[PDB]
């Protein structure tokens, strides 16, 4: 019985704004 | 019997905004 | 036996002009 | 037996002009 | 038996002109 | 029974904006 | 922004 | 924003 | 931004 894992993301920032 | 896992996302930030 | 499950997903962001901008997904 | 499973995704960002800008995904 | 599993992804960024700029992914 | 792992990701910053 | 706490999966403990 | 607490899955404890 | 805490998967502990 053998494990694994995924990975954790963190994103602290303003998403894309526009300028058009 | 073997485990696994997913991953935990995190985001702390303003989602997109328009500018048109 | 055994297995694990997929990972959380996020999409963000949007601006400017537009068109055909939209998602689609098929989990585990 | 045993097995792990997938990891997360994020998409961000968007600006300027646009067109055909959008995702698609098929997890584990 | 046993096996690890995939890792994360991030996408970011966008400006200027545009077109055909968008993703696609197929995890573990 | 043997393990593995995934790979974490951290991006502390604001996504892209536009100027068009 | 601001502070955080722990994260990270575990195993077989 | 602001503070956080713990997160993270567990296992077999 | 700001501070962080632990991360990182585990194993077989």
């Amino acid at each position: 019985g053998g494990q694994g894992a995924g990975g954790d993301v963190i994103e602290v920032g303003g998403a894309g704004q526009g300028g058009y």
Side-chain angles (χ1 to χ4, degrees), chain A:
Chain A
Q3 276 208 25
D8 297 333
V9 191
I10 292 188
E11 190 48 42
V12 186
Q17 316 182 17
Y20 197 109

